[PDB]
Short mmCIF file of C-alpha atoms in Angstrom, two decimals:
data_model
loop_
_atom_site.label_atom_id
_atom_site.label_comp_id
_atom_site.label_asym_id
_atom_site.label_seq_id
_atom_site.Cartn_x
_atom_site.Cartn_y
_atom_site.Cartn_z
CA UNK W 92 4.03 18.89 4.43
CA UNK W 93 4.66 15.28 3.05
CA UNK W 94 1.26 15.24 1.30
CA UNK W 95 -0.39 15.11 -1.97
CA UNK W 96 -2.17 18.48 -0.95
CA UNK W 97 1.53 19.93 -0.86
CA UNK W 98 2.59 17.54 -4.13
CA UNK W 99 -0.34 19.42 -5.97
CA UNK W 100 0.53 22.74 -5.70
CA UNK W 101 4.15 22.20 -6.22
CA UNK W 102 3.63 19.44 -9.46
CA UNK W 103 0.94 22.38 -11.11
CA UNK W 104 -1.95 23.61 -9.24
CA UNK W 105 -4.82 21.62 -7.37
CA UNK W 106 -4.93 17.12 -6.82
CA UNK W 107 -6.67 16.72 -9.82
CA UNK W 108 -3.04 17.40 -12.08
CA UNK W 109 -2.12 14.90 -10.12
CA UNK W 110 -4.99 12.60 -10.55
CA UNK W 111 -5.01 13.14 -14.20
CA UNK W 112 -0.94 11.37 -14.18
CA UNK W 113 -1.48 8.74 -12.12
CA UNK W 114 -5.53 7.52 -12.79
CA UNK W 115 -3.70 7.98 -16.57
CA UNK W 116 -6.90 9.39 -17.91
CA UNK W 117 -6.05 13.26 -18.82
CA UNK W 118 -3.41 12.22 -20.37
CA UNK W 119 -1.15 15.97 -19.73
CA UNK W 120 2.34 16.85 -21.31
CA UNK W 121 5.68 15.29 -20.52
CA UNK W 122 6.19 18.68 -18.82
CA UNK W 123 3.37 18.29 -16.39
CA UNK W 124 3.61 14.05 -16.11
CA UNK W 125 7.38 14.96 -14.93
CA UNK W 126 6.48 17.68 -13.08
CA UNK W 127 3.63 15.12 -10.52
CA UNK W 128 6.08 12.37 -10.09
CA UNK W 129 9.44 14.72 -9.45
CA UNK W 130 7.26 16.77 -6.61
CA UNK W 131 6.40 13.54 -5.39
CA UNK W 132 9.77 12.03 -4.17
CA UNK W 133 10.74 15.88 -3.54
CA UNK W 134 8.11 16.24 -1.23
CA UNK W 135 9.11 12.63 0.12
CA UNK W 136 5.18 12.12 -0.24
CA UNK W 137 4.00 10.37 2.72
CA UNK W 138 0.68 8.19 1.62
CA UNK W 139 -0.28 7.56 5.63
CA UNK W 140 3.53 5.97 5.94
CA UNK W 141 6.19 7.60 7.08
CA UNK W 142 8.02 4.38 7.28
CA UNK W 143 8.31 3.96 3.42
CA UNK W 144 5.73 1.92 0.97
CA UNK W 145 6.42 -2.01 0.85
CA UNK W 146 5.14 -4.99 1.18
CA UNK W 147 1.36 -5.35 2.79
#
């Protein structure tokens, strides 16, 4: 599915990799920073928008 429980697995393991990249806290390898936003647009991530993610 077009979700960041999907994105997870496929970027590493579990949301929190994810998490880590995005809050910028963790701050993980190139490998693994890569790795979260490729899956993303892969995935074609869906945050509750199937549409796209513009505007207000």
């Amino acid at each position: 599915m077009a979700t960041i429980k999907d994105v997870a697995k496929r970027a590493n393991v579990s949301t929190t990799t994810v998490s880590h990249v995005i809050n910028k806290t963790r701050f993980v390898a190139e490998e693994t920073r890569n790795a979260v936003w490729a899956a993303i647009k892969e995935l074609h991530y869906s945050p509750s928008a199937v549409a796209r993610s513009l505007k207000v």
